[PDB]
Amino acid sequence: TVLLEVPFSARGDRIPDAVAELRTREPIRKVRTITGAEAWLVSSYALCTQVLEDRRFSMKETAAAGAPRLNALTVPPEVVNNMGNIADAGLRKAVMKAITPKAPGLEQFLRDTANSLLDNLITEGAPADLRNDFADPLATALHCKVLGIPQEDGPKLFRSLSIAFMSSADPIPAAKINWDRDIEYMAGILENPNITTGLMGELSRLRKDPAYSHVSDELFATIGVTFFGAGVISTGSFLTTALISLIQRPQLRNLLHEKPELIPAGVEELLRINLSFADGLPRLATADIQVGDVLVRKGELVLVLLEGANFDPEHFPNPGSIELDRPNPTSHLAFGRGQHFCPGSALGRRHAQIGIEALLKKMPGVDLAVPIDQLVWRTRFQRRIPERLPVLW
């Protein structure tokens, strides 16, 4: 037989029985990635947290020439370290402020947008596609608003993303075409005097502030492209697969409809059980480091399997069960942990809470319109998502 291959399954509606057997028997194990490289797959909560909290397991070094790769880069190497470059440029606080859901009018914009999407679907009549015609448009709208760019520009930026977030053994020609086009767009946004709000409005002013005169124009455009893309794919994909989890649980659907104040606790459990990340998070060892029974050598690739941690019964008892009263509810790794913890975590939570709240109010009888096994799971992609999510109500 051959070395165990990753990823195990592109299905995002159920975790393979194999994850638990692996966590029990070999919570750090050698695997082969789609490039042919070997890697260490880490699947216990204890060992996942160890790796993510040890900066000697480096994110930015995964982009080094000649390194073992999970998949091919779809961006310039520089972009892997985007957050680090943001911090170095003195821009961290400004970016963080721009992407909080606490911005005035933001939460109202999201409710209005979700309700308008849902009303259109209702007028159209069942079946409706909750990914393409609800979750992703809601994510796209949200990020145009957060960035301060026109809503009409959202769809064009969105269309890059089915290629941008591919998980490919080889470089993708279309990825560079789309990247360069999107950078040109964001550079234009920075020169556009009408753009005065949101992240791009603030970046446009900092660009002309003397305290930032030696920060490159390319970094400013890059922040816009990177935050739009990673945000839209992460929120759209999470909400989509969370809606599947909810639809599959009519009693939970009914409980949250009846007591919407439990929706935050519900979204937090839906984050914990979410299978939207298709691959472990990659890190490259910059030293020889003991992880469980394995001495990981300098230059080796480590993959942090988020559902490994998040379904670990030693940390989350009855891990497949959605429990709204856990003692450790936010201690999951859905947003990562440590140096690279997600800066959009609050925005992601609110996108999902508001989307779910609006759906349950508009479509209290929502159900799948096809048998679950008929969902088509996107392959060789950095997220697990159904190509369409047909529902009736």
Ligand code: HEM
């Ligand atoms: C439900 C929504 C989201 C989920 C599940 C999610 C998940 C994650 C995870 C797991 C990481 C850690 C990656 C690693 O350590 O290798 C991360 C980092 C990051 N996220 Fe998110 N994310 C979400 C929303 C967002 C949003 C809305 C934005 C921006 C608008 C965003 C921007 C980023 C960035 C820039 C990083 C890299 C941070 C760094 O390198 O220090 N994410 N996210």
Ligand SMILES: Nc1cccc(-c2cccc(-c3cn[nH]c3N)c2)c1
């Ligand atoms: N929301 C999210 C989740 C996981 C990773 C990122 C993120 C943010 C910035 C850059 C990169 C990136 C681009 N190429 N390779 C990597 N790791 C990835 C964002």
Ligand SMILES: Nc1cccc(-c2cccc(-c3cn[nH]c3N)c2)c1
């Ligand atoms: N080629 C392309 C075009 C537009 C956006 C992006 C993009 C933007 C942000 C993150 C990533 C990415 C690629 N691999 N992993 C991550 N997070 C990719 C790439």
